[PDB]
């Protein structure tokens, strides 16, 4: 949504419940800037 925007998120280890591509698509649904490798301007690493 609007709140879940303008934020950089990185995921590198998904759970068996949801695979990594599925979680990436989900987070992209709300408008999360996906980053494969975290950088100096990353909110956190998942």
């Amino acid at each position: 949504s609007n709140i879940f925007e303008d934020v950089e998120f990185c995921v590198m280890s998904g759970t068996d419940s949801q695979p990594k591509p599925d979680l990436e698509n989900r987070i992209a649904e709300f408008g999360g800037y996906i980053v494969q490798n975290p950088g100096p301007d990353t909110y956190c690493v998942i």
């Binding site: 996906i34 980053v35 494969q36 490798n37 950088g39």
Partner: protein, 51 residues
């Protein structure tokens, strides 16, 4: 197997025989590093320009 170079041994200005050079021993180096985009994780082209 791959010849380093196909050279031409020259006994004289007239006598000439083609030979090939190989390296039976060669230093082992790790694969060269590759630059990658931190976000998409895809190869990036590097271009050097002088001005």
């Amino acid at each position: 197997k791959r010849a380093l170079s196909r050279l031409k041994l020259k006994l004289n200005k007239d006598i000439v025989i083609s030979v090939g050079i190989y390296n039976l021993v060669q230093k082992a180096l790790k694969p060269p590093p590759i630059k990658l985009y931190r976000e998409t994780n895809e190869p990036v082209k590097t271009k050097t320009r002088t001005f």
